[PDB]
Amino acid sequence: STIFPFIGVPEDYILPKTEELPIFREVAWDFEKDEPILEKGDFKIIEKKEALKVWIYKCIKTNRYEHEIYSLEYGTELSELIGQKYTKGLTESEASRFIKEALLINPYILEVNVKSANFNRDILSANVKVSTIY
Amino acid sequence: STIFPFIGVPEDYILPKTEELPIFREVAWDFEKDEPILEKGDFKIIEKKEALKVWIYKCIKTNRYEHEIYSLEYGTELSELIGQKYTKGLTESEASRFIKEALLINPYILEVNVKSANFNRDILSANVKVSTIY
Amino acid sequence: ADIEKITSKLVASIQLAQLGGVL
Amino acid sequence: ADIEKITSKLVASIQLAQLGGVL
Amino acid sequence: ADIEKITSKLVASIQLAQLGGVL
Amino acid sequence: MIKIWVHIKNGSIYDITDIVDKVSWSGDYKSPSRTLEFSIIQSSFDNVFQQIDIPIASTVCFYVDEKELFRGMIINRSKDSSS
Amino acid sequence: QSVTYTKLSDVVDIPKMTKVDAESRVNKGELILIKEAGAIRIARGVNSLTELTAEKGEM
Amino acid sequence: MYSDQTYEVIKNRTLENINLDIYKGEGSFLNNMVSGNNLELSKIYLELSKMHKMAFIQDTYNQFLDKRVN
Amino acid sequence: EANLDKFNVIEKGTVTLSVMFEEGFNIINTTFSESMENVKNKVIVVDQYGSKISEKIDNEIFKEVNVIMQKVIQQQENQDVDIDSEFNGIEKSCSLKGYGDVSCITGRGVKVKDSYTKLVGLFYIDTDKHTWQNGEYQIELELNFQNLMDEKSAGQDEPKEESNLG
Amino acid sequence: MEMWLRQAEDRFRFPVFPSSFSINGKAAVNSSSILKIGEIATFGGVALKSISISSFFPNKDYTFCDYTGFPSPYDCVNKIEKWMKEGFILRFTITETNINMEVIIEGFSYEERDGTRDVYFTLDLKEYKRIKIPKV
Amino acid sequence: MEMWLRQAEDRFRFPVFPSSFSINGKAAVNSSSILKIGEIATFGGVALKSISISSFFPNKDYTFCDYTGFPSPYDCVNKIEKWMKEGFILRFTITETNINMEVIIEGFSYEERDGTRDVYFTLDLKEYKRIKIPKVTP
Amino acid sequence: MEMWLRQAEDRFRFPVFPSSFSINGKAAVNSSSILKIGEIATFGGVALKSISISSFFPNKDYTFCDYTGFPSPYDCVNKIEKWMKEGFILRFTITETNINMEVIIEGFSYEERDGTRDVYFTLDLKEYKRIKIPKVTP
């Protein structure tokens, strides 16, 4: 009977209550052998920071623009630094930036710091601190 | 309910009263035994400065967030200084600020000054001067 | 907001002139 | 030219008020 | 006095426009 | 020498020349009435600068060189808290 | 610093004891845990020595 | 009503109903005595609210539902 | 009032806000005014023909303003007008800017405290405006004065209870 | 004397105490002119205090340092820059004086100007007052 | 000479007399013009005076101090800051001169700049005037 | 340390490191007032940083030069001028510090002032920020 003078239908104007992010859960992973972990004949699900460890490991391990399935923001660019394409200081600064920007897309991660950086032989070492909501 | 006193009050109009606090009265308390005092088989009531002394003693002796019955304003944070958690100068500043902010919620107390402060062995001494309306 | 203040002043002036009478 | 800008703003405000309805 | 000058300019403009003819 | 006097409803008469801040007197040929505008200094923050109140519709008289030029009714009254 | 009034976030609860009990225990030269100011902490940082001579003062 | 009845409101009402000459404010002897039981009354009000939802058959949980259907 | 998709007809001032404006707490500036321009204190009734039948003067308004400002209303055959509604008195207003919540909107009553006399007055909101910019939020209201709030209770409404419940 | 900037339990103590410090305070005065008597003035309210600090963050353990164990220069820079970015309300205190108040950071500048890798800085702070909304 | 700041019966005397003091006074002159004559001027009333003071509050008894028994530097700072905050009306006087008037505080700044723990300050004062209130004629 | 300006893969390294560098940062504080209380303030967001650089472009190989192989002074001038004219977004980095961000050029001035044919310059850079674009809800 009565007209609806707005675009759409009354159903589209119901807003679900905004709540905290649901608890982060992920399939367990074995870093030494690079395999998912089975428990009692099924996949094993871990919670909170362990799942975050799995996600961070997987994110760091991939290259940024190599795969079609991923968007342009997923992955890291650490492969461009191999072979000393830049000076040592430029490589250090770029590595810090790459790690920070790659990791920060996850809404469960609040801040990232790359603190220690040392060149010994052909190896580059660094320390990374990640702060989450947990 | 007719006059409009915001620009000015009419000449004939008489102000109803001047706003003042009643005489501060409190049940008497003894400090060496921590009890209320009974007089002729009933509680003894004192007034003005002695009542203010009782109130001040009670306010200093309580902790701030410990009890659910009280609000967030009542109490004192002096228990956070025990054990030299801060340096000595920071301890002096914090003690002065804590005492002033705790005492100034009583409307009958006008100004608080923490003048002297000395460190001798494990004892901190100070002089507090309270100014009231009386 | 300048237009609002100017309009307020103009309205007040017009109302005063209306009370005073205009030929 | 200030008078022209003031008049333009006043006209726009009056038109919006007319669309909204004035008692 | 700004309102008076603005009103004077507006009145002069309106009188000129009336002389010129407005559709 | 300009003097301003105000008559209040009860019967009191005040000379407010020492309080006036600004005066304006004007008229036009297309209206039958002349107008007078003036301001006084009055502070609510400071107790010293509190003055008398002049209610709406009280008579005000304007003198220049011991000659009366204006007599009229008060119509508007306004108070700004900042000034 | 000193260890007095250091609070332990790990501990959940402890057996109840009255104030006079805690004071008498401290006077005997014992290191105890108490509940005070809405937390669980140690009472005072004293060692086992109780009898004092001219050579060994209260310090 | 039941939701409105809270520790602050009932405490204010109790202090207004009591008639002494002493001072009634935070840190008073009378205020200290009055508080402590009003908090428990505020706690009791919630169970009093809940009992009606316990009783009926539309929302009875598991064991009360079993009793009422039996 | 059109609230969302619903249309309402409400009477002004029924809802009174909890927040009160005080000089030392949440007021940026105020401007109080009083005016006499729209005063009416005489009513003249004319018949359908234009001939006058009756007149009336209000003494309370006439006490404030010595002059008489007349109004003319006409009654038809099937209407009998009430004179006492046509009188109009002195208008007192306020222009306020300060801090508040999103509850202060047109059609509600608000309370403003007088600094010198510590008296509270009731006002009706006629115009409002809320702005958010650069991380700050301010309100501007146009208020119309109703009356002075009575100290304690005017009629002193007491809860009527029996001495003994049972 | 010591200088501290603290955000709740997170505290920072400056490693090198500055050469001087000054507090600025002002009050507002409203002026009017009355005919034939001249200018008059009335009190209008007090303004917020301000304080500015200049020093450097050392890159090595100097003899004149306040204590031992402070972080690196750019760690201090990053911590203070984050505090300024989020608009936190901080507590600033100088011991053995009457300076103990809540502030907000207005400016932060840092530079390097020699061969020692020390970082000189300037920090501008402004007093913070919370507004009280009455209720009934 | 001596320098005093007094609020009712609450009197304060400066421990160290400054190196110099100066009074600033002005008069308002209105400017107009007349065609073919140029600029003209009229008198527009006198303005309020002002004075600025610079000294320090000693942290110890010096040989050049005006008197003994003065309070600590930060007690003096606290007193003057409270007076400035509340907007009190004060009386300012310098003995053996013509400076004796009511003032109001406009600015107060203090600092430390050496190893002696002395507090240096600058104080800005403005003259205060009262207007008579009209009286109803008999 | 080293100083670099890079536009995509087009990288430029300054032959002579300047005598000093400084970062300027500010936050916006809104000012208001309340009757009978005085001035109050609120937080209004952070502002963009800025840095200014002063050095010269050598016309010969010096012992204090950072590296060998750099272009002629007016080649460097032409490159930077083209970048400033087109309004490119660049990346500015000083190694061994925390300075690594995207910038846009605000001013560029150069001069000659002796017999060595070296070109002295001053470069003003301003930080650049991007806003996220909203996404339609699924």
Asked if A59 contacts A71 with a C-beta cutoff of 8 angstroms, the reply is no
| Rounded-to-10 torsion of CA B90, B91, B92, B93 | 50
Spatial distance between the Cα atoms of B129 and J66, rounded to a whole number of angstroms:
34
What is the rounded CA–CA span in Å between residue F43 and residue F83? 8
For residue K106, the SS3 value is: strand
- How many Cα neighbours within 13 Å face the side chain of H34? 23
Q: Residue I164 is encoded by which pair of tokens? A: 């003994």
What is the nearest CA distance from C3 to chain D, expressed in angstroms?
7
Chain B interface, Cβ < 8 Å to G: 63, 65-66, 79, 82-85
Q: Exposed, middle or buried: residue F4 (CB in 10 Å: 0-12, 13-18, 19+)?
A: buried
CA distances from G34 to G8, G10, G30, G40, L6 (A): 11, 14, 12, 6, 63
Q: What are chain I's partners, defined as 3 or more CB pairs within 8 angstroms?
A: A, B, C, F, J, L
Q: CA-CA distance, F70 to F59, in Å (whole number)?
A: 10
Contact B119, B134 (CB under 8 A): no
For residue J7 the two structure tokens come to 């955000």
Q: Which residue has the tokens 């250091």?
A: G6
* Angstrom distance (rounded) from CA C23 to CA F83: 37
Q: Inter-chain contact H39–B69, Cβ cutoff 8 Å?
A: yes
d(CA K74, CA K89): 22
**If we measure between CA atoms, which residue out of I166, I119, F33, H63 comes closest to residue B1?**
I119
Rounded to a whole number, what is the distance in Å from the CA of G44 to chain B's nearest CA? 9
How far, in Å, CA of J74 to CA of J82, rounded? 12
Asked if I36 and F75 touch (Cβ cutoff 8 Å), the reply is yes
Tell me the CB-side half-sphere exposure of residue K18, using CA atoms within 13 A: 15
Distance CA L102, CA L104 (A): 7
Q: Any CB–CB contact under 8 A between I150 and chain L?
A: no
Query: Tell me, what DSSP letter sits at residue H26?
Result: T
Best mutation target, K104, K128, K132, K133, to test chain F (most F CBs within 10 A): K133
Residues of chain B with C-beta less than 8 angstroms from the C-beta of J93:
90, 93
Q: Render the burial of L56-84: b for 16+ CB within 10 Å, e for the rest.
A: bbbeeeeeeeeeeebeebeebbeebeebb
DSSP-derived letter for residue A10 is G
Q: Going along chain I, which residue ranges are E strands? A: 2-3, 6-7, 16-21, 27-35, 42-46, 52-57, 70-74, 91-98, 109-113, 120-133, 136-148
Specify which residues I148 forms β-bridges with: I121
Header resolution in angstroms: 2.9
Q: Which residues are bridge partners to B123 per DSSP? A: B120
Residues L85/L130, Cβ–Cβ less than 8 Å: no
Neighbouring CB atoms inside 10 A of B62's CB total 15
Other CB atoms within 10 Å distance of the CB of residue I138: 15
Number of H helices, E strands in chain L: 1, 8
**Nearest residue to G11 via CA among G43, G47, G45, G35:** G35
Q: How far apart are CA J123 and CA K81, in angstroms?
A: 24
DSSP codes joined into one string, B47-96: ETHHHHHHHHHHHHHSBSSS-SSS-SSSSB-GGGSTTT-S-HHHHHHHHH
Task: Give the angle subtended at the CA of L57 by the CAs of L53 and L60, to the nearest 5°.
Answer: 155
State whether residue H19 sits within 8 Å of chain B by CB. Answer: no
B-interface mutation test, from G4, G5, G34, most B Cβ less than 10 A away: G5
CA separation for the pair L121, L79 (Å, rounded): 13
Strands in chain A per DSSP E: 25-27, 29-30, 35-36, 45-47, 109-120, 123-132
CA dihedral H57, H60, H65, H67 (to 10 degrees): -90
**E strands in J2-130:** 3-7, 10-13, 21-34, 38-46, 50-57, 90-94, 100-112, 119-127
Q: Answer for the pair L59, L118: CB distance below 8 angstroms, yes or no.
A: yes
The vertex-A122 CA angle with A117 and A127, nearest 5°, equals: 25
Region of residue C3 (left: phi > 0; alpha: psi -120 to 50; beta: else): alpha
Taking residue I5's Cβ as centre, other Cβ atoms within 10 Å add up to: 12
**Chain D residue nearest residue E5, CA to CA:** D3
Chain centre to alpha carbon of residue K111: 19
Length of chain E: 23
- Within 8 A of I115 by CB-CB distance, chain F residues are 44
Flag if I64 and F57 touch (Cβ within 8 Å).
yes
The helix or strand, by DSSP H or E, that contains position B113, with its residue range, turns out to be: strand B109-120
Instruction: Say which amino acid occupies E6.
Output: I
